[PDB]
RNA sequence: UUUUUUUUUUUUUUUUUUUU
RNA sequence: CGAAGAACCUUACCUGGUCUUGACAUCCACGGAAGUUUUCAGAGAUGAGAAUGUGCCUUCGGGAACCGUGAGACAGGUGCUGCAUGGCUGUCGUCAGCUCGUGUUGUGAAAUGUUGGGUUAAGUCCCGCAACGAGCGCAACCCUUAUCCUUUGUUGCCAGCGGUCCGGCCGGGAACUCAAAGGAGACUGCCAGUGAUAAACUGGAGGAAGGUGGGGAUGACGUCAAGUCAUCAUGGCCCUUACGACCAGGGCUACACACGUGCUACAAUGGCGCAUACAAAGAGAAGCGACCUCGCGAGAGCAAGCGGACCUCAUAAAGUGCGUCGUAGUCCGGAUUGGAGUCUGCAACUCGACUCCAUGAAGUCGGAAUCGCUAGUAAUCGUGGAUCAGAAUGCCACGGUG
């Protein structure tokens, strides 16, 4: 009956930031404003292998962009011509340069997010994804974790249908600010209305 | 050589020294009876020194920064308790046996939401 | 009595900075003051970082924000000059202004 | 309620060493202001003394003898209906109750100033004539009598 | 087996010295249990109670010294005798305890 | 009255010196009760629209005037974010 | 196993679909 | 009430004057340098004129600051349902919580440890009982104390002397308040009584608290099918010639009725007239302002200062010493009404808010029966703040004779 972030409340304790930067008194507004826009652009570039962690550092307002994706080799490009492009279009909004750094998602099966991006991809096939939903969780759980609970709310049937389903492939200590746990999301549609999946990945105890 | 004390009661904000002999009680530049002349509380400020024969052996000098005579009458009590505590270890027993050693710290588990007393827990003879 | 009102976010940084003056601005003139504090802002800090609208994720921090008077009894150039040469130590806000 | 923490300790009076005189004026207050009211009650013990020119403080007890009660009646319904049943007020409640009866007469009692109400009312008490004696004696005509109906 | 059980706070460690007091007195003859029992040797039927029920549910061998209140059909082995006190059990046990090691061969 | 008179204030707010408070520094001295020239004030009072000190104001961080807290530079409805980014430095557990 | 401290208080309308 | 300003006011609403891409904001099409100053009209929106101006790159290209008219796309509003849901808050709650990963007596709504003996104020603690233990409440991190410990000396701040031209004045040094950062010390500790030398409860060694020492605080599941539906955050659904946005007016208060919330007036445990002893809680450059000039005063002027003990707004009211009434509707009652004035304003008058002198409506201790308020707590005894071009008696928080 509660949804409860383990993440965000505990930045220094095994759960690092989505952004760590410093603006004084007057200079905060356009930084923050750009912090939605460069994020917007990056994820629609990355979606061909998603983005697990989207890490906006700002060493001097100018932006040390640090992007965890499953396949770097497609945003590197045929070697360097999309790394030019990105660094242009993420500096442009900010008015200041943006140093596009990659990282590789170290096996998508174990991740802070990519368990939700696997299940929400299936809703683009439009057929009965249920055949593949418990499966695609249990696969990723043979390659990592100790428990996971998964929730789907959305338009998942026909004509006027909106209902919500819940599933438990292991136990979940719900908040514990010491544990290795991750909370996260991802969002789909199916020509009728939203399908928004959420996760609690009890990876390990401490 | 000399001794000292300080207090914080209702809301004084006063000190005291002790000097070697002749038995008086001044407040910067006037005597006790001039500063407290009708305040029914005037009697206590010298009372545990007169015991131990102050007249040729101790002498007293009070100064002030929040006048406040109805609090000062006891702020001086814990103050002169301090002064004595280095002159004579023996009177720790006296000062304690007559209360002069105490200072203001106690409410009795009072009102926070509406119930008069609020620490004492729900209570029975088997339930 | 010209009051150089040294401050920092942390105790560690203002400590290093006052300790240079109480010695070096003292060299041939004043008994220069520096440890003497002000209403040091030991409060609690709350910014939202909730990844959606769900329970809390407003991670509460603590601060020092520690502040002191450096005091110089006379402007006497042949003793103070090291504090004006200390300009390079940008991280401490000095508020000399009086 | 299990703890023995109950009542008010205070210090005695500034002249003669009694909790009696302290508590007496520490009911008479009617608005707080303590110190000058303690000075008026001192003048009350002097305006008593003008009746003889001796130690009339020796007669403050003698008067209060006719005004200390035994009984009080409290809220009691324990046999399906009003059933009093006085029971005694304790040894320390004896003259503390008498102050209330002296004060509740004094408030309006008509004499020449604030001291001369309490001087005369404790004169009357000495002679058994007192308003405070009559306020006592009415709860003796009432409660102390229903000791034969309990 | 070392001294590290005494860490943290002495009351956080005496919380477990009470756990010792309540567990070694109740499980001290079975501190390992890496696999299930294979046979049950037993001297009561109504206090011990549960033991004969668990055994019979699982079809386990049972060796049981018993009296005139019994139900012999719930044991593989009745041994007819005085149910209680140290004199009666001690007649049987110095053979039982020998055999369960000298028969190993 | 939502975006409103902003278009009318913006064209004359910045000149409240030229309309009065520096144009006054000779002729307005005589013109006072303390100085009694009765002829004069009544022929400086004509600008009506700029006529300072008057400013309808611009609450900026709220798109419309659901009031404006002059102690704080924000709208009357706006307080709750300051527990979630610190813009009111005494916003803590309530005094009731 | 004596158990009358007054007798009464209008209809509604809550009610998160569904096979499992 | 929302409304913390229903007479420019965040506009209801009564209207009239404009509109329905409207006030605000884009992507291309052809083009423009951006603004200062009065005069007459007009209730405001808006209308009719007269003068004065011409910026930065500079590929003379493309445009910037920055203003246009013309295209196609195209703009919006507290409208409540708790019932798609998440934050958040509450009075219940400082109960020591429930129900579960497995098990299994109950098919299932029974809780299944609450059972059987005893023991504590206490699910207190010895066990037992077919019951585990799993972790989120637990174990407690906290803030302010309060007493101090070092380093300190702060506009602070003065032990003991140095000058006094009598003001910590300025020499002059480090006891302590103060200011305060790092932090620290009280435990059944040892003494008597208690009983099972359990329990814990009393007094006390010793204390700045004592058996949570106090005061703030967090406020778990469970929280009424209660909210925050008027910033929430958003799923299902609004009206759109419309619930969309520009702008001048005004009138909410009447008066029979109550009924109360909030105010008081009924005189000496009162005040009245002259004179005397001590605190501070606060807010403070859309700032706060002394000394000092003119004063019957609301209220004018001069202006040092003062950014956080320096400037200022308190010179709390009580109380105390000497005089005056003599129980007297007054000397006290501001109900109020004769005139006189003001700080702003388009604005207060059929609409206020306060001032100076004349006065003086109910007044003399009211019954029944709506709950204040147990402690350092309600009589009693004050000062501040925001909304906001602004007058709340609302409320809001700590001091103190008591």
From Swiss-Prot, chain C:
GO terms for cellular component: cytoplasm; cytosol; cytosolic small ribosomal subunit; small ribosomal subunit; transcription elongation factor complex. Pfam families: Ribosomal_S10 (PF00338). InterPro entries: Ribosomal_uS10, Ribosomal_uS10_CS, Ribosomal_uS10_dom, Ribosomal_uS10_dom_sf. Involved in the binding of tRNA to the ribosomes. Part of the processive rRNA transcription and antitermination complex (rrnTAC). The complex forms an RNA-chaperone ring around the RNA exit tunnel of RNA polymerase (RNAP). It supports rapid transcription and antitermination of rRNA operons, cotranscriptional rRNA folding, and annealing of distal rRNA regions to allow correct ribosome biogenesis. In complex with NusB is involved in the regulation of ribosomal RNA (rRNA) biosynthesis by transcriptional antitermination. Part of the 30S ribosomal subunit. Can also form a heterodimer with the transcription antitermination protein NusB. Binding of S10 to NusB is mutually exclusive with its incorporation into the ribosome. The rRNA transcription and antitermination complex (rrnTAC) consists of RNAP, NusA, NusB, NusE (this protein), NusG, SubB, ribosomal protein S4, DNA and precursor rRNA; S4 is more flexible than other subunits. SUPFAM superfamilies: Ribosomal protein S10 (SSF54999). The keyword Hydrolase does not apply. Belongs to the universal ribosomal protein uS10 family. Coiled coil: none annotated. The gene is rpsJ.
Swiss-Prot record, chain D:
The lineage of its organism: Bacteria, Pseudomonadati, Pseudomonadota, Gammaproteobacteria, Enterobacterales. GO terms for molecular function: mRNA binding; rRNA binding; structural constituent of ribosome; tRNA binding. Transmembrane segments: none annotated. This is Small ribosomal subunit protein uS7. GO terms for cellular component: cytoplasm; cytosol; cytosolic small ribosomal subunit; membrane; ribosome. Part of the 30S ribosomal subunit. Contacts proteins S9 and S11. Cross-links to IF3 and the P and E site tRNAs. The chain holds residues 3 to 152 of 179 of the full protein. The strain K12 sequence is shown. Has been predicted to contact the N-terminal domain of IF-3 based on footprint studies; exactly how IF-3 interacts with the 30S subunit is controversial. Keywords: Ribonucleoprotein, Ribosomal protein, RNA-binding, rRNA-binding, tRNA-binding. One of the primary rRNA binding proteins, it binds directly to 16S rRNA where it nucleates assembly of the head domain of the 30S subunit. Is located at the subunit interface close to the decoding center, where it has been shown to contact mRNA. Has been shown to contact tRNA in both the P and E sites; it probably blocks exit of the E site tRNA. The keyword Cell membrane does not apply.
Swiss-Prot record, chain E:
It comes from the Bacteria. Coiled coil: none annotated. Part of the 30S ribosomal subunit, contacts bS1. Some nascent polypeptide chains are able to cross-link to this protein in situ. In collided ribosomes contacts ribosome rescue factor SmrB. Required for ribosomal protein bS1 (rpsA) to bind to the 30S subunit. Belongs to the universal ribosomal protein uS2 family. This is Small ribosomal subunit protein uS2. The gene is rpsB. The chain holds residues 122 to 226 of 241 of the full protein.
Curated annotation (Swiss-Prot), chain F:
The keyword GTP-binding does not apply. One of its GO terms (cellular component) is cytoplasm. One of its GO terms (molecular function) is structural constituent of ribosome. GO terms for biological process: cytoplasmic translation; ribosomal small subunit assembly; translation. The keyword Transport does not apply. Gene3D superfamilies: 1.10.287.1480. It comes from the Bacteria. Keywords: Ribonucleoprotein, Ribosomal protein. Belongs to the universal ribosomal protein uS14 family. Binds 16S rRNA, required for the assembly of 30S particles and may also be responsible for determining the conformation of the 16S rRNA at the A site. HAMAP family: Ribosomal_uS14_1 (MF_00537). Part of the 30S ribosomal subunit. Contacts proteins S3 and S10. This is Small ribosomal subunit protein uS14. It comes from Escherichia coli (strain K12). The gene is rpsN.
